[PDB]
């Protein structure tokens, strides 16, 4: 205390930190073109939302599911590519430093970036599976993909109700895979928080779940959530553009060449 971005970089280079847990939000996906309703022509005006969080609210969805399924349509195919923040996390995995990446994003960029599903916790759900909003019948996500791409609201062939992809809405429980945090966060010897306002629970509360000895690096536009309210001696904030913060850390780590090579090959293949 106080620790600096260079101190964290030197911990990773010394392999003093080998078990990095990462928490990311819509911050890391904006460089890729994907909107963030907390920001920014307005993302809300474009998606016709009284307020931002409405798009992931069941009451609003039942009144009008079109904004949600517009966003769903944009995200399904490879319309968007991973940016340097994704590839940084991929490189963390390639070097055997990533314990787990917890994401609030449903853009599937983490996977595309080449992070195995075993290393991912898609805490706010996935398009891979769907559920009837009335009769709770499960479906594979592929069934409703065609309907969503063709601008049709998918309906239950049993109950007649609206079938929704397994994106966690406000009021819904998180996927069971979220419970992996109970094992992961006590084991973490470094926590990275990238591109999140930590405005959504119980995801935000995970920042508190690491041992007090563990540095918490925030790379974000501004100091936020528990890290603002309940700081600790070994917290580091690199406030600014998330991609700038990441590239700064990459340079301090000495990975800039390796990153440049990785990003070129991987963006070549898309």
């Amino acid at each position: 205390g106080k620790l600096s971005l260079q101190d964290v970089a030197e911990l990773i280079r010394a392999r003093a930190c080998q078990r990095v847990v990462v928490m990311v939000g819509a911050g890391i996906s904006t460089p890729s073109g994907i909107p963030d309703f907390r920001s920014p022509y307005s993302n809300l005006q474009q998606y016709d939302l009284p307020y931002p969080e409405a798009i992931f609210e069941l009451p609003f969805f039942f009144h009008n599911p079109k904004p949600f399924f517009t966003l769903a349509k944009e995200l399904y195919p490879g319309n968007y590519k991973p940016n340097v923040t994704h590839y940084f996390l991929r490189l963390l995995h390639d070097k055997g430093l990533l314990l787990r990446l917890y994401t609030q994003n449903i853009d599937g960029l983490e996977r595309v970036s080449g992070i195995p599903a075993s290393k991912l916790v898609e805490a706010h759900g996935t398009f891979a599976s769907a559920t009837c909003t009335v009769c709770q019948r499960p479906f594979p996500g592929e069934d409703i993909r065609a309907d969503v791409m063709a601008d049709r609201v998918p309906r239950c062939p049993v109950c007649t109700g609206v079938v929704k992809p397994d994106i966690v809405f406000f009021g819904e429980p998180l996927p069971q895979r979220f419970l992996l945090h109970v094992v992961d966060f006590p084991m973490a010897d470094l926590l990275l928080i990238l591109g999140t306002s930590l405005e959504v629970e119980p995801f935000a509360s995970l920042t508190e779940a690491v041992r007090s000895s563990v540095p918490r690096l925030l790379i974000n536009r501004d100091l936020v959530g528990p890290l603002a309210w309940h700081p600790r001696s070994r917290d580091v904030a690199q406030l600014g553009d998330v991609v700038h913060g990441v590239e700064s850390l990459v340079e301090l780590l000495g990975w800039t060449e390796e990153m440049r090579d990785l990003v070129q090959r991987e963006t070549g293949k898309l």
Partner: peptide, 7 residues
């Protein structure tokens, strides 16, 4: 423990 906004 379900999805809700913080504070």
């Amino acid at each position: 423990r379900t999805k809700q906004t913080a504070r």
